[PDB]
Amino acid sequence: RVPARMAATLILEPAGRCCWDEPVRIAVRGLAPEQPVTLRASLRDEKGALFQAHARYRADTLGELDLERAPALGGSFAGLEPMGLLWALEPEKPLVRLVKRDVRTPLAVELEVLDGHDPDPGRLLCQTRHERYFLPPGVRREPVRVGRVRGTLFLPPEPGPFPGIVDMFGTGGGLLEYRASLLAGKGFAVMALAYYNYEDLPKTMETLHLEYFEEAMNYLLSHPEVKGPGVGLLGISKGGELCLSMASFLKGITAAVVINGSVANVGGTLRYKGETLPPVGVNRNRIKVTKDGYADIVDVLNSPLEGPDQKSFIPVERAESTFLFLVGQDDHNWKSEFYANEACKRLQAHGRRKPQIICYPETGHYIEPPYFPLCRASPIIWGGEPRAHAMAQVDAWKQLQTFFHKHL
């Protein structure tokens, strides 16, 4: 009698170094013909927090399970969804946002193949560790500490020069580098820019001075490996708001991608030389408690279209820049589509080019780079449905690349 068959084996393409924003093809060989199995993906973030997804499958008649050929039958998702084990990842503890800050180390996804379709998993038939990197091949990380400017520059491998982008996130303070590092992998010099509560910067954003942002952009533009003659701006939330403010008041901005930004100045006072924008007013009575114990704050901010709140409207008509607005239709942080439309109306009322707006159905506030799992709530809701939001993230990433390549 011949020995028993060797154990099942997982095969990935690509087998080696995969960036976070890149698709992978997962296959298992050496299962029994038509064997029912459960695949489980597990990830621990830099804070030790667990994220998991699982789906049921059935091997084919050869005992092969290939996720670009076999559909998920149920679990965290169903259908021919090769990347579902990643986009459907859910935190073990509700309310937990994924924490990834050091772009120099990968996030590991542990993949398990477990026997059977029982809700309580069978025996482990095979496993593999799939590392996903945030610093693309040959991308150079260069911290920025020039004048008062604080951020981190990412450059592609030599030779330059490269189109330059300033990258900005919203409120929370500190510096998120992961989008800039990934985007530098597409041929751009990208500066992740901090503006409060990081290193020696002012601890709060009670008042923000656009002069700081002018300095940052001038530094990027003056870099020996940045192409010019202007820069791109990429911002989400308050960061997109700042893209509009920068483009309205400052020179040297060629194009801006605004992701769920606001045309109202919110949360503090903006100053540039003799000019000021007061914060738009709030109405905490407009809060909705639904349909769990979560706040819905989408209606709290006053309209920048009536009363003294018109003062907080960013004068986008003064911008020379081209704009692309990427909005989640289900944004519950604030009225992103309304802001995009009102920016467009302001611009057209002054004979400026009409900006492209892309509105993604069932997508929420946090449109992150691809395969970042949806955070539904963290407490307030942010909006989005897992699959719709995931595919919006994948598409937005291609849209901004195309746009920046065209204009920069």
- Are 113 and 146 part of one and the same domain? no
Query: In Å, how far are 11, 86, 145, 206 from 150, measured between CA atoms?
Result: 43, 33, 5, 18
Query: Is 237 a residue of the active site?
Result: yes
- Are 296 and 359 part of one and the same domain? yes
- Cβ contact 12:128 at 8 Å: yes
Cis peptide before 315 (omega within 30 of 0): no
All residues at 6 or more sequence positions from 369 whose CB lies less than 8 Å from its CB, including other chains: 20, 21, 178, 179, 182, 183, 393, 397
CATH number (domain holding residue 315)? 3.40.50.1820
All residues at 6 or more sequence positions from 120 whose CB lies less than 8 Å from its CB, including other chains: none
- Are 73 and 162 part of one and the same domain? no
236: amino acid identity, one letter:
I
- Are 381 and 321 part of one and the same domain? yes
SS3 for the chain is CCCCCCCCEEEEECCCCEECCCCCEEEEECCCCCCEEEEEEEEECCCCCEEEEEEEEECCCCCCEECCCCCECEECCCECCCCHHHHCCEECCCCCCCCCCCCCCCEEEEEEEEECCCCCCCCEEEEEEEEEECCCCCCEEEEEEECCEEEEEEECCCCCCECEEEEECCCCCCCCCHHHHHHHHHCCEEEEECCCCCCCCCCCCCEEEHHHHHHHHHHHHCCCCECCCCEEEEEECHHHHHHHHHHHHCCCEEEEEEECCCCECCCCEEEECCEEECCCCECHHHCEECCCCCEECCCCECCCCCHHHHHHECCHHHCCCEEEEEEECCCCCCCHHHHHHHHHHHHHHCCCCCCEEEEECCECCCCCCCCCCCCCECCEECCECHHHHHHHHHHHHHHHHHHHHHHC
Asked which of 119, 135, 151 is the last residue of a domain, the reply is 135
What is d(CA 44, CA 360) in angstroms, rounded to the nearest whole number? 29
Q: Are strands 149-155 and 189-193 parallel, antiparallel or unpaired?
A: antiparallel
CATH number (domain holding residue 84)? 2.60.40.2240
What is d(CA 365, CA 336) in angstroms, rounded to the nearest whole number? 8
Query: In Å, how far are 55, 84, 111, 374 from 11, measured between CA atoms?
Result: 18, 17, 11, 27
- Are 55 and 85 part of one and the same domain? yes
Strand partners, 381: 377
* Residue 348: HSE in the Cβ half-sphere, 13 Å Cα cutoff: 9
The active-site residue out of 181, 237, 312, 321 is 237
What is d(CA 242, CA 169) in angstroms, rounded to the nearest whole number? 9
Burial of 374 (0-12, 13-18, 19+ CB in 10 A): buried
What is d(CA 41, CA 52) in angstroms, rounded to the nearest whole number? 6
- Are 225 and 321 part of one and the same domain? yes
- Are 106 and 162 part of one and the same domain? no
Burial of 257 (0-12, 13-18, 19+ CB in 10 A): buried
The active-site residue out of 21, 66, 330, 331 is 331
Burial of 326 (0-12, 13-18, 19+ CB in 10 A): buried
- Are 146 and 255 part of one and the same domain? yes
Query: Is 365 a residue of the active site?
Result: yes
Range of the domain at 15: 1-135
- Cβ contact 403:255 at 8 Å: yes
Method: X-ray
Cis peptide before 291 (omega within 30 of 0): yes
Burial of 224 (0-12, 13-18, 19+ CB in 10 A): exposed
* Residue 243: HSE in the Cβ half-sphere, 13 Å Cα cutoff: 33
Q: Please report the resolution in angstroms.
A: 2.1
- Are 198 and 340 part of one and the same domain? yes
- Are 403 and 322 part of one and the same domain? yes
- Cβ contact 366:330 at 8 Å: no
- Cβ contact 220:226 at 8 Å: yes
Asked which of 74, 108, 135 is the last residue of a domain, the reply is 135
- Phi, psi (degrees; rounded to nearest 5) at 376: -75, -35
CA proximity to 360, closest of 330, 391, 328: 328
Cis peptide before 71 (omega within 30 of 0): no
For the chain, how many structural domains are there in total?
A: 2
Asked which of 135, 162, 186 is the last residue of a domain, the reply is 135
Strand partners, 43: 51, 109
- Are 223 and 109 part of one and the same domain? no
- Are 115 and 255 part of one and the same domain? no
- Cβ contact 268:207 at 8 Å: yes
